[PDB]
Amino acid sequence: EKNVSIVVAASVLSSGIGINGQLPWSISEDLKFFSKITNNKCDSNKKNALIMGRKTWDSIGRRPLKNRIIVVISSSLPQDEADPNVVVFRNLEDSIENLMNDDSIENIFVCGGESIYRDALKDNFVDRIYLTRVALEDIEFDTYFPEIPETFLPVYMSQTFCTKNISYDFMIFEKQEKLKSIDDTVDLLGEIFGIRKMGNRHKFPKEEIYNTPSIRFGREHYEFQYLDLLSRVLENGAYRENRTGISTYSIFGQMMRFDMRESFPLLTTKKVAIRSIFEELIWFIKGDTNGNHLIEKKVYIWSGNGSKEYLERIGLGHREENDLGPIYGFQWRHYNGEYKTMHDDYTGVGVDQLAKLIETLKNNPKDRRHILTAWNPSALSQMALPPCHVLSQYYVTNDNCLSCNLYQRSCDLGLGSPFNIASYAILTMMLAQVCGYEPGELAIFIGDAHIYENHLTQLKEQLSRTPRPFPQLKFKRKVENIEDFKWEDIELIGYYPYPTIKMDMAV
Amino acid sequence: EKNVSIVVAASVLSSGIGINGQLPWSISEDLKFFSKITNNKCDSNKKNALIMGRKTWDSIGRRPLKNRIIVVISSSLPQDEADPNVVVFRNLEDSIENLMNDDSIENIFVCGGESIYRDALKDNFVDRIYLTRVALEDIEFDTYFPEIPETFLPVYMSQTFCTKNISYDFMIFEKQEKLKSIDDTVDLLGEIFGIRKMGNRHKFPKEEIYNTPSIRFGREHYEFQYLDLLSRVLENGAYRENRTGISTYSIFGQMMRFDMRESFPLLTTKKVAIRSIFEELIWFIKGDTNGNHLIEKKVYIWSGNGSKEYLERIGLGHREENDLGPIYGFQWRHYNGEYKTMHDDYTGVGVDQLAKLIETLKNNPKDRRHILTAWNPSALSQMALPPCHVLSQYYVTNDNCLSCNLYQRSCDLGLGSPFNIASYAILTMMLAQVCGYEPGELAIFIGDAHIYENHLTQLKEQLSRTPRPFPQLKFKRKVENIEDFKWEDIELIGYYPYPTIKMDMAV
Ligand SMILES: NC(=O)C1=CN([C@@H]2O[C@H](COP(=O)(O)OP(=O)(O)OC[C@H]3O[C@@H](n4cnc5c(N)ncnc54)[C@H](OP(=O)(O)O)[C@@H]3O)[C@@H](O)[C@H]2O)C=CC1
Ligand SMILES: NC(=O)C1=CN([C@@H]2O[C@H](COP(=O)(O)OP(=O)(O)OC[C@H]3O[C@@H](n4cnc5c(N)ncnc54)[C@H](OP(=O)(O)O)[C@@H]3O)[C@@H](O)[C@H]2O)C=CC1
Ligand SMILES: CN(Cc1cnc2nc(N)nc(N)c2n1)c1ccc(C(=O)N[C@@H](CCC(=O)O)C(=O)O)cc1
Ligand SMILES: CN(Cc1cnc2nc(N)nc(N)c2n1)c1ccc(C(=O)N[C@@H](CCC(=O)O)C(=O)O)cc1
Ligand SMILES: Nc1nc(=O)c2c(Cc3ccc(C(=O)Nc4ccccc4C(=O)O)cc3)c[nH]c2[nH]1
Ligand SMILES: Nc1nc(=O)c2c(Cc3ccc(C(=O)Nc4ccccc4C(=O)O)cc3)c[nH]c2[nH]1
Ligand SMILES: O=c1[nH]c(=O)n([C@H]2C[C@H](O)[C@@H](COP(=O)(O)O)O2)cc1F
Ligand SMILES: O=c1[nH]c(=O)n([C@H]2C[C@H](O)[C@@H](COP(=O)(O)O)O2)cc1F
């Protein structure tokens, strides 16, 4: 028995694959993907067979594919022995004669329209599925890819790629059937030493809290860098109290890694409020600490830490209603500046870290001191809340890309973390355009990674959703100064998330 | 054809296993390891056979081991059928009849003295070796474990454990003989997209720069967290210039993780100057920036950045010879203090972060703001060198352990990194004793991880050395204040490193 794999490129939601006898898109890299997989063989004196329907055979110009033998399923095509690279069969079952008879065929690929896909799955001929999920859904389709049967399980999901501002993935599905001593030794050592063995302090998450657990070795989509951290906290998190009335499950010392070259790290397993994230970031960039300016733009994330009852509770009753004090955006633009109120004019006072960062990224790109800090011990007592994202470093690669590292001392994985991922991604892209670079990578290093106990049912629901390709984010215009960005300048392309999940903030 | 494994506990350097008819040590957990490994079986109605010499049979009191059959090799013991749990054979080869005849034996273990080990290896009877490396060498031995033949390769090396201040490892050696489509798909995607696929920017290190490459899935010893970072830089490092004349190979965004409960992360692949590391750390704690105080104690690590030629070169010619300026230990003890010279009295000026950190660690252990920073933009111009270890956070676990996270913007993997690993480990243990806790974990997050080009032959030599168990570090007395620590108070137990490697610092 030889292998029979399905190759298909379908839309991410409705699984559309065609329109009016052709594809709904033109993605060059996806065709090169089709070519390399269908040519991938082990024996030199053998070829692969590509099965396709007649309409698909028409759509490719009715011309052969090099180094391969095309098999056309048709009820009315002549079975002429003229073309040795193209053969015609009357039904799909007969065309699977290559298995038993033809020993010159190594592997078999099904890749030819809805009619052939649906019959190849209903008759249980397919061993593996190569799916290319494309992020295009507000268009018209007339040919779809059938629903994948439950007998298949995902084993691979690539990172998100981008062609002509279109996001797409690459997945592999395997059909289900019915080193040995190293794992045993580690288990025995774990029985002897309790939590003395550090592995037992970092236990692998159980399958019941592992997002898409059938993907073991192919967890390439960088949203798994966030989802697996959720799983790691649910497994190893210590129940601990904190300044709020809501206890958490907390571990210490974690990291996440994200790409920004070919996609934008906005979570797809939950609809993330991208507008509020931006309006908070430009609020930091402008140097503003007036909490009213966010409420005037219908952004209330800082209303909890900016009520008169909260400020008098922490010893800042002399402060105005939403005067959050010297915080993010006051240490960015006026570091070590004497803070009075939020209405005063601070032009010239303090150290403008953001300005020095932009000027250093352009004049000395390979400098190792592109640092933006917000942890100022002399001003902590005056802040409405100590900074969570305390320090960030930036890096110019040899191909003119801008990467970013962030250390955040405390991380609300339910609310703050999805914001921190997107917020510092936008900041890096802003810094890249003003400095003339392209976006690079984003790494976030976390101290107290925790989950609030009132987010448990919500985050467990989020872990039940298999991720979708990351969207794209582009700027509509090039700005003179970094302060000039507006919400209308941001174009979010290809974002098809799961429904939003409500989670209450702990004050 | 059953399995024949060797179980042995030998010294780390000389491979001593016995003295005067008994063990050179008493490690309880190692006996539980011997028991669990020799009892590990698959069939309920089968037993394992334990082969041992006569003198070894004497050393265990001539009493049986539960659920197992002991096989004694002796030329003079009576072959009485009285005891069914003990059988005697006249030579080692005859006793390997367990393979052909007794189908009631599942696995075979050789574990009985130098004479049996050497004959079992010279006759090629052993399939696998379970080695427990013990860090005790300045004692007396009379029975040794033979040199492991080249036909064996290590496949596992556990973390370092500790019993009665003795460090030890657990290794597995396999004998050499004569998830398939996922790797193919990822390789094809790497051909289509160049450095567009993030995996190609983080290529797995080649075997020629991978320390002990035969250990694929068992790289548990946390010195591999440092050695693999060296391998990762040699593979992906971009050749970049910097403020010095010595270029580096640099990557961005890396992390290392170390245990501190059962061992001390002092590198064994190179003899690390631990005294200089400590004398620099207490120099930081005391708040001292006078570089002469380190030179007076024969510690010259800061002499390069504190020469009259270097200081005048970077615009500090007004400064005294070794006046390094407000640096580590001046932001620790006197944050935001106006720095004059190194001779002035700074008692009372600035924010004492170290004092507040200790007081916060004791009074509010689960607080999420145990932060010690050294990045002060207002003082960077006055420093002889901006801080490399810029910010650190501390964490109290539910079992009264103190963990530490460090963000390092720039990392000299040849010189600074071995110091940074050990230094912040010592600092965390000092903070743990003054606050009444035990050492926890150490995680180091790195920005610009690089290797200087004049360290290439040296670090490749270091990568050729298989690691040894981490040592132990204990304090001889409980101190009143953290400033009271002295070098004589530190006892380094079980440190048997490889010879030191000379590497020049880039000024
Ligand atoms: N995104 C992707 O990966 C792909 C998309 N497509 C798109 O899908 C569309 C085409 O698919 P689709 O509409 O389903 O047409 P098909 O490609 O499935 O071709 C159908 C033809 O195959 C023959 N056929 C099908 N079933 C049988 C049967 N049971 N017995 C005998 N003959 C059979 C018939 O030929 P006959 O009339 O001669 O009897 C039929 O007309 C196009 O738009 C194409 O571009 C196609 C391939 C891949
Ligand atoms: N750290 C560890 O893992 C272990 C350490 N040890 C230690 O090592 C020491 C003992 O080892 P060791 O000194 O080598 O003594 P052995 O344990 O190897 O026993 C030797 C005896 O086995 C018999 N024997 C050996 N070879 C032959 C042969 N070719 N034909 C017939 N009989 C043979 C002889 O018994 P006879 O004289 O009756 O003929 C010989 O005296 C002890 O200190 C023990 O504690 C032991 C086991 C494990
Ligand atoms: C059958 N078909 C429709 C089509 C389009 N995109 C797809 N995409 C995927 N992922 N899977 C499919 N089955 C698929 N099929 C095809 C098949 C081949 C070519 C084609 O020109 N292939 C060249 C591509 C050459 C190149 O781009 O380098 C080859 O050599 O295979 C176009 C459409
Ligand atoms: C043959 N021998 C010497 C000895 C000591 N340490 C070793 N350590 C290792 N790693 N490997 C060996 N072969 C070894 N052998 C032995 C064998 C068994 C026991 C013993 O008492 N074993 C108990 C373990 C008792 C316990 O768990 O405390 C068992 O149930 O097997 C002591 C010494
Ligand atoms: N404990 C604690 N956690 C914090 O995150 C935090 C912040 C920042 C912040 C970030 C995000 C939110 C928030 O509500 N996000 C949302 C989530 C889902 C759907 C919609 C939204 C939406 O905002 O529309 C609130 C606050 C300041 N102070 C804090 N304290
Ligand atoms: N560029 C750059 N790199 C740095 O590491 C650095 C430091 C800290 C430091 C740390 C270590 C050394 C050093 O020489 N270590 C050794 C290594 C092997 C064997 C012996 C020694 C020994 O000292 O005895 C020098 C300096 C201050 N300023 C710096 N600038
Ligand atoms: O950007 C943010 N990210 C974040 O994770 N938090 C959460 C983390 C923690 O749950 C809470 C309070 O921090 P702490 O209790 O350490 O003072 O703020 C707040 C932000 F503003
Ligand atoms: O504790 C230290 N750790 C460290 O890694 N360096 C190295 C890193 C780098 O090679 C150099 C400073 O880089 P730069 O001056 O360009 O920021 O010092 C120096 C220390 F003092």
Short mmCIF file of C-alpha atoms in Angstrom, two decimals, chain A residues 29-30 32-34 36-37 40 128 130 155-156 158-163 168 170 172 174 179-182 184-186 188-189 191-193 195-199 201-202 217-218 220 222 238-244 248 250-255 257-262 310 335-336 351 353 365-373 375-379 385-387 390-399 403-410 440-443 445-448 450 452, chain B residues 3 29-30 32-34 36-37 40 128 130 155-156 158-159 161-163 168 170 172 174 179-182 184-186 188-189 191-193 195-199 201-202 217-218 220 222 238-244 246 248 250-255 257-262 310 335-336 351 353 365-373 375-378 385-386 390-399 403-411 440-443 445-448 450 452:
data_model
loop_
_atom_site.label_atom_id
_atom_site.label_comp_id
_atom_site.label_asym_id
_atom_site.label_seq_id
_atom_site.Cartn_x
_atom_site.Cartn_y
_atom_site.Cartn_z
CA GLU A 29 4.47 30.66 -2.81
CA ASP A 30 1.50 28.30 -2.49
CA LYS A 32 5.73 26.40 -5.24
CA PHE A 33 4.48 24.53 -2.17
CA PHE A 34 2.24 22.35 -4.36
CA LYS A 36 7.70 20.71 -4.05
CA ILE A 37 5.33 18.35 -2.23
CA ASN A 40 9.00 14.97 -3.25
CA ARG A 128 -2.89 12.60 4.87
CA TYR A 130 -1.92 19.08 3.16
CA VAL A 155 -0.20 17.28 13.41
CA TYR A 156 1.37 20.50 12.08
CA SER A 158 3.12 26.47 10.29
CA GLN A 159 3.76 30.10 11.10
CA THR A 160 1.70 32.69 9.25
CA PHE A 161 3.11 33.86 5.90
CA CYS A 162 2.19 36.89 3.80
CA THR A 163 1.78 37.44 0.06
CA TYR A 168 -1.94 32.01 5.07
CA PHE A 170 0.29 25.39 6.20
CA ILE A 172 -0.89 18.67 7.97
CA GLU A 174 -2.98 12.55 9.62
CA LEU A 179 14.35 7.01 23.62
CA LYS A 180 12.37 4.15 25.15
CA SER A 181 14.67 3.98 28.19
CA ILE A 182 15.35 7.72 28.58
CA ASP A 184 11.67 5.70 31.96
CA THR A 185 14.82 6.90 33.74
CA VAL A 186 13.51 10.47 34.00
CA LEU A 188 12.10 7.11 38.06
CA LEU A 189 14.27 10.08 39.03
CA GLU A 191 9.69 9.54 41.88
CA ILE A 192 12.83 9.58 44.06
CA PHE A 193 13.23 13.36 44.19
CA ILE A 195 9.98 18.83 43.68
CA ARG A 196 13.73 18.53 44.18
CA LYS A 197 13.97 17.62 40.49
CA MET A 198 13.38 20.84 38.56
CA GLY A 199 11.44 18.99 35.87
CA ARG A 201 8.46 22.01 39.00
CA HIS A 202 7.89 22.47 35.23
CA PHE A 217 5.95 18.33 17.10
CA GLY A 218 4.53 20.94 14.72
CA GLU A 220 4.99 26.38 14.73
CA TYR A 222 3.49 31.54 17.22
CA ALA A 238 0.84 28.12 42.57
CA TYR A 239 -2.31 29.46 44.24
CA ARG A 240 -1.19 32.81 45.66
CA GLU A 241 -2.85 35.92 47.05
CA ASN A 242 -1.98 39.47 45.98
CA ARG A 243 -2.95 43.11 46.57
CA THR A 244 -6.39 42.51 45.03
CA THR A 248 -4.02 33.91 41.02
CA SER A 250 1.37 32.03 39.27
CA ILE A 251 4.68 30.76 37.92
CA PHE A 252 7.92 32.72 37.57
CA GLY A 253 10.20 33.16 34.56
CA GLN A 254 8.57 32.60 31.17
CA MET A 255 9.08 33.83 27.61
CA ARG A 257 8.41 34.62 20.82
CA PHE A 258 6.59 36.23 17.90
CA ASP A 259 7.28 36.98 14.26
CA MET A 260 6.53 40.39 12.78
CA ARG A 261 8.04 40.05 9.29
CA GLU A 262 5.25 37.98 7.71
CA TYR A 310 -8.77 54.02 44.46
CA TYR A 335 12.45 60.58 32.93
CA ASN A 336 13.37 61.79 36.44
CA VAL A 351 15.16 62.73 29.89
CA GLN A 353 14.19 58.37 26.18
CA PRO A 365 22.03 50.94 14.58
CA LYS A 366 24.38 48.23 15.87
CA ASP A 367 24.67 49.94 19.26
CA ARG A 368 23.86 47.61 22.15
CA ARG A 369 22.15 50.23 24.35
CA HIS A 370 18.78 50.83 22.64
CA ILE A 371 16.99 50.69 25.99
CA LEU A 372 13.63 52.14 27.02
CA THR A 373 12.93 51.80 30.75
CA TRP A 375 11.11 51.56 36.36
CA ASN A 376 12.09 54.68 38.32
CA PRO A 377 12.30 54.01 42.09
CA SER A 378 12.19 57.74 42.86
CA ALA A 379 8.73 58.07 41.26
CA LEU A 385 0.31 51.71 39.55
CA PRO A 386 3.92 50.54 39.18
CA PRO A 387 4.88 49.74 35.59
CA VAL A 390 9.33 47.85 32.91
CA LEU A 391 12.13 47.71 30.34
CA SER A 392 12.47 47.07 26.61
CA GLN A 393 15.45 46.77 24.26
CA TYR A 394 15.61 47.20 20.49
CA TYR A 395 17.91 45.70 17.89
CA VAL A 396 18.72 46.44 14.24
CA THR A 397 19.53 43.35 12.20
CA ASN A 398 22.01 43.25 9.33
CA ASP A 399 19.08 43.30 6.87
CA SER A 403 13.48 43.47 16.72
CA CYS A 404 12.20 44.11 20.24
CA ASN A 405 12.67 42.50 23.65
CA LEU A 406 10.40 43.28 26.60
CA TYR A 407 10.70 42.33 30.26
CA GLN A 408 7.39 42.60 32.13
CA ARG A 409 7.53 41.98 35.88
CA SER A 410 3.85 41.01 36.21
CA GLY A 440 11.64 42.04 12.96
CA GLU A 441 10.91 39.73 15.90
CA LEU A 442 9.18 40.26 19.25
CA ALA A 443 10.25 38.44 22.42
CA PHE A 445 10.23 37.89 28.99
CA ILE A 446 7.86 37.51 31.93
CA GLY A 447 8.42 37.47 35.66
CA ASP A 448 5.16 36.77 37.52
CA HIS A 450 -0.34 34.43 36.47
CA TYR A 452 -6.74 35.27 37.93
CA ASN B 3 18.87 -6.47 27.27
CA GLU B 29 18.83 8.47 46.65
CA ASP B 30 21.33 6.52 44.53
CA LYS B 32 16.65 4.02 45.47
CA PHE B 33 17.73 4.63 41.86
CA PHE B 34 19.48 1.25 41.76
CA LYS B 36 13.89 1.27 40.82
CA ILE B 37 15.99 0.63 37.71
CA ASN B 40 11.63 -1.97 36.22
CA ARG B 128 23.51 0.04 27.95
CA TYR B 130 23.52 3.52 33.78
CA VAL B 155 22.19 9.81 25.38
CA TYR B 156 21.15 11.37 28.71
CA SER B 158 20.38 14.54 34.30
CA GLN B 159 20.50 17.71 36.35
CA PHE B 161 21.42 16.50 42.59
CA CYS B 162 22.69 16.93 46.14
CA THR B 163 22.86 14.62 49.16
CA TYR B 168 25.99 13.75 41.49
CA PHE B 170 22.70 10.33 36.24
CA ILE B 172 22.80 6.75 30.15
CA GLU B 174 23.82 3.38 24.47
CA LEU B 179 7.24 12.64 12.44
CA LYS B 180 8.60 11.70 9.01
CA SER B 181 6.54 14.01 6.79
CA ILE B 182 6.55 16.98 9.18
CA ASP B 184 10.00 17.13 5.11
CA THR B 185 7.25 19.75 4.95
CA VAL B 186 9.18 22.17 7.17
CA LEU B 188 10.32 22.49 1.86
CA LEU B 189 8.77 25.58 3.44
CA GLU B 191 13.34 26.40 0.69
CA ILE B 192 10.43 28.52 -0.60
CA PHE B 193 10.70 31.30 1.98
CA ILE B 195 14.82 34.21 5.90
CA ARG B 196 11.11 34.95 5.61
CA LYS B 197 10.44 31.76 7.59
CA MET B 198 11.44 32.47 11.19
CA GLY B 199 12.75 28.93 11.63
CA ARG B 201 16.58 32.62 11.34
CA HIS B 202 16.91 30.17 14.26
CA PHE B 217 16.65 14.16 24.01
CA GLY B 218 18.36 14.04 27.41
CA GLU B 220 18.87 17.88 31.28
CA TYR B 222 21.47 22.91 33.01
CA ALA B 238 25.55 37.85 12.45
CA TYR B 239 29.02 39.35 12.04
CA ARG B 240 28.68 42.86 13.47
CA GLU B 241 31.02 45.66 14.52
CA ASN B 242 30.74 47.56 17.82
CA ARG B 243 32.39 50.30 19.88
CA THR B 244 35.51 48.14 20.30
CA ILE B 246 36.77 43.36 18.02
CA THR B 248 31.21 39.75 17.29
CA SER B 250 25.41 38.35 17.51
CA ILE B 251 21.85 37.13 17.89
CA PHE B 252 19.00 38.84 19.74
CA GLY B 253 16.60 37.46 22.34
CA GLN B 254 17.83 34.39 24.23
CA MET B 255 17.33 32.86 27.67
CA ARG B 257 17.52 28.61 32.99
CA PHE B 258 19.37 27.20 36.00
CA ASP B 259 18.54 25.30 39.16
CA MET B 260 19.80 26.49 42.54
CA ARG B 261 18.02 24.09 44.93
CA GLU B 262 20.23 21.04 44.37
CA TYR B 310 40.26 54.46 28.24
CA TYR B 335 19.78 55.49 43.06
CA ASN B 336 19.46 58.93 41.44
CA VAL B 351 17.39 55.41 46.96
CA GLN B 353 17.04 49.63 46.43
CA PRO B 365 6.91 37.96 50.07
CA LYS B 366 4.24 37.48 47.40
CA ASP B 367 4.56 41.09 46.25
CA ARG B 368 5.20 41.32 42.51
CA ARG B 369 7.53 44.35 42.66
CA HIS B 370 10.78 42.88 44.05
CA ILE B 371 12.86 44.70 41.45
CA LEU B 372 16.49 45.87 41.46
CA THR B 373 17.40 48.08 38.50
CA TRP B 375 19.49 51.49 34.21
CA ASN B 376 19.39 55.21 35.05
CA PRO B 377 19.32 57.39 31.90
CA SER B 378 20.32 60.46 33.92
CA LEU B 385 30.34 51.61 31.05
CA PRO B 386 26.54 51.33 30.91
CA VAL B 390 20.26 46.06 33.81
CA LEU B 391 17.28 44.78 35.81
CA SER B 392 16.50 41.81 38.06
CA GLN B 393 13.31 40.60 39.73
CA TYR B 394 12.89 38.24 42.68
CA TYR B 395 10.10 35.86 43.63
CA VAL B 396 9.18 33.95 46.80
CA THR B 397 7.63 30.55 46.17
CA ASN B 398 4.96 28.92 48.32
CA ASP B 399 7.65 26.63 49.81
CA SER B 403 14.00 32.69 42.60
CA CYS B 404 15.65 35.34 40.44
CA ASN B 405 15.13 36.69 36.92
CA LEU B 406 17.73 38.87 35.20
CA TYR B 407 17.52 40.84 31.96
CA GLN B 408 20.93 41.39 30.37
CA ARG B 409 21.02 43.75 27.39
CA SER B 410 24.51 42.70 26.24
CA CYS B 411 26.23 39.38 26.94
CA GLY B 440 15.19 28.70 44.09
CA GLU B 441 15.70 29.03 40.33
CA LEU B 442 17.75 31.39 38.16
CA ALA B 443 16.57 32.57 34.75
CA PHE B 445 17.02 36.78 29.69
CA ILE B 446 19.50 38.14 27.15
CA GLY B 447 19.25 40.86 24.53
CA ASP B 448 22.45 41.03 22.46
CA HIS B 450 27.28 37.60 21.09
CA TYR B 452 33.81 38.04 20.15
#
